[PDB]
From a paper:
[name]-related N-acetyltransferase (GNAT) toxin, with an acetyltransferase activity-dependent mechanism of translation inhibition, represents a relatively new and expanding family of type II TA toxins. We here describe a group of GNAT-Xre TA modules widely distributed among Pseudomonas species. It has been also demonstrated that the translational repression function of GNAT-type toxin depend on its acetyltransferase activity which transfers the acetyl group from acetyl coenzyme A (AcCoA) to the amine group of aa-tRNAs, subsequently resulting in the inhibition of translation.
In addition, both the structures of PacT homologues from P. jinjuensis and [name] are in complex with AcCoA, and share similar fold with PacT in superposition (mean RMSD 0.28Å). Because GNAT-Xre toxins are widespread in Pseudomonas species, which also have highly conserved Fur proteins, we also tested the binding between GNAT toxins and Fur proteins from P. jinjuensis and [name]. Consistently, both PacT homologs could specifically bind to the DNA-binding domain of Fur. We also found that PacT homologs from other Pseudomonas species could bind to the Fur protein, suggesting that the direct PacT–Fur interaction is a common mechanism for PacT-type toxins.
Author numbering:
A (entry chain B), B (entry chain A): 2 to 188
The structure:
Amino acid sequence: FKPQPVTLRRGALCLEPLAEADLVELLSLAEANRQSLIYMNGPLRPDWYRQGLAEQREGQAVIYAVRQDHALVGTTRFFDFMPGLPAVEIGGTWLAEDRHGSGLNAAIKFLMLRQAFEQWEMVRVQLKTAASNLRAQRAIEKLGARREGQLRNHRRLADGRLDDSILYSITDRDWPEIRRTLETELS
Amino acid sequence: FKPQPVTLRRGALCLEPLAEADLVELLSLAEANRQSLIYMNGPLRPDWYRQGLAEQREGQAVIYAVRQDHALVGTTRFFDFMPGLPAVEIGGTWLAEDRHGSGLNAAIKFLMLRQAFEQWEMVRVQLKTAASNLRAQRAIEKLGARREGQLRNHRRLADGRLDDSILYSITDRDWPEIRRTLETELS
Ligand SMILES: CC(C)(COP(=O)(O)OP(=O)(O)OC[C@H]1O[C@@H](n2cnc3c(N)ncnc32)[C@H](O)[C@@H]1OP(=O)(O)O)[C@@H](O)C(=O)NCCC(=O)NCCS
Ligand SMILES: CC(C)(COP(=O)(O)OP(=O)(O)OC[C@H]1O[C@@H](n2cnc3c(N)ncnc32)[C@H](O)[C@@H]1OP(=O)(O)O)[C@@H](O)C(=O)NCCC(=O)NCCS
């Protein structure tokens, strides 16, 4: 098993790797949305996507810009690669507020899980948010991902104060019945 | 915190760093208790020890050979360091069959926990053992840790047969009480 960069695409949407070149149009975008992005410190400081781009060369993550032939509307990434299994996470996912409520997320998740399950041949896909990020929480739960539990004192917010973290999973068995409820709102 | 090699001791029990010369005695001792270790990936492969020695220099694990006065009696390690909080894992624990229920673990645990929580001023210590691993699950419950959740499809046993894991964690508010007992324990 290895994770090589891939470009994922469904209709109007295009998922490509975070190149250097994008950090700019990615950054001030984040500054437009400094309200919706407050449960994931590491927003407008562009040391974030360089940390982002870094991880890849180590082989640690595979990190994505989300687009509609631009404009970038946000970013997501695979990471926490566990090849014995194999398994991965999704996370570091955020989107211009205009894209919320719109099912863009759903489109992103479907392309990434299908890749993860049907192509990487994985058995577990992690997804964690914060105990206080109820928006992120329902989203994952609209995705049909089992809530394995909250991990007390697991993160600090954009204020440097502690928060517990929720943790979800979707096994290899889960994937057909996950895949197909996305293929539902998508219709 | 800085994860520096440290020697902790309690009576006839000296947990001291792992050096490359211990590894040959540790693979041996492991093949002895080959059956009592089936719920763990790694332990009969010398390079699973080497791997912790290596990440000792990368800062990702401090790694302990457990001795009973003089006999190399087991291993147990620290890992999954999250500094931004900070918080740690304990794991990689295994003792030769003969010292099970003979009270050595409790002591190997207090020692580290007291190090991880009073010296390291940590806020979260997490442990995970196998869903199929029933002794381990009682032993962690005897510490005072909270069962945070089953984690499906998350691990493999010596067979390689997939399995689930159980997250247990202890925060700092829970320490005082956990220290306490493990002093009641010993008293
Ligand atoms: C989460 C994010 C993708 C927004 O996604 P999204 O497109 O709005 O997801 P959805 O469109 O399905 O809607 C989210 C759900 O949360 C609901 N919701 C939003 N705010 C809510 C609130 N205070 N309370 C309760 N529910 C709320 C929404 O109403 C919606 O549920 P609904 O259909 O019942 O109305 C992103 O914008 C973000 O800012 N941070 C994510 C950080 C993270 O955790 N990343 C890792 C997870 S992959
Ligand atoms: C650690 C290990 C050596 C067990 O040793 P131990 O720590 O001495 O066990 P302890 O005596 O501490 O506690 C075990 C207790 O659970 C009980 N127990 C529960 N279910 C049991 C079972 N199926 N078989 C045996 N004992 C069981 C034991 O009787 C014992 O006494 P008590 O519960 O009545 O007081 C070993 O089983 C192992 O393989 N470890 C896996 C390590 C791992 O992955 N976890 C890492 C996180 S530390």
